[PDB]
Design a protein around this ligand. Structure first.
Ligand SMILES: NC(=O)c1cccc(N)c1
Length: 181
């Protein structure tokens, strides 16, 4: 209901820290990471976890969760910590498999400080397929009962570089990376 939240800065020389970053620096090493913050919103975590449990029931052996990158403007950050992604491949939120997709300044706009922002996000990819621009939601998995859909969409199922989610509680903004270049 009241998705209040706190922002904890990760200490350089931490496990959790090095892990994130690692994956970030994996394509964005030419970048200077000013700060990294974990975002703690119990209401988002709950609504997300619930979502996962019911997917964990639905998709058999599937690995529903992925940790993907997302870049926005500084102005969006506050909204994201509170609200976390509220309402060519469709109209949803785009997450990148690799940090560098997100680093484009069309996405992670730079502020006056030239400081940039990318969330390292828990996304319930679940079962996915190729998406197209005419998508407000994911396509049905079969034509017979068009009711049961996919969980998300990608550019390429056998070697995706991005996922597009369409629902209000499918991602949790666990970390915020602030970097400079
Ligand atoms: N904004 C993003 O992180 C992103 C991810 C994948 C694709 C696009 N176009 C954007």
């Amino acid at each position: 209901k009241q998705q209040n939240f706190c922002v904890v800065e990760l200490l350089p020389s931490d496990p959790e820290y090095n892990t994130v970053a690692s994956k970030f620096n994996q394509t964005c090493s030419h970048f200077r990471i000013e700060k990294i913050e974990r975002i703690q919103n119990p209401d988002l975590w709950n609504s997300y976890q619930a979502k996962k449990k019911t997917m964990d029931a639905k998709n058999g052996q599937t690995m529903n969760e992925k940790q993907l990158f997302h870049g926005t403007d500084a102005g969006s950050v506050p909204h994201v910590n509170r609200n976390g992604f509220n309402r060519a491949y469709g109209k949803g939120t785009y997450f990148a498999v690799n940090a560098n997709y997100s680093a484009n300044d069309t996405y992670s706009r730079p502020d006056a400080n030239g400081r940039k922002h990318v969330y390292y996000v828990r996304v319930l990819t679940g079962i996915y397929t190729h998406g197209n621009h005419s998508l407000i939601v994911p396509p049905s998995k079969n034509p017979q009962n068009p009711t049961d859909l996919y969980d998300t969409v990608t550019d390429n199922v056998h070697h995706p570089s991005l996922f597009v989610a369409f629902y209000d509680y499918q991602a949790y903004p666990e970390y915020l990376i602030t970097f400079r270049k």
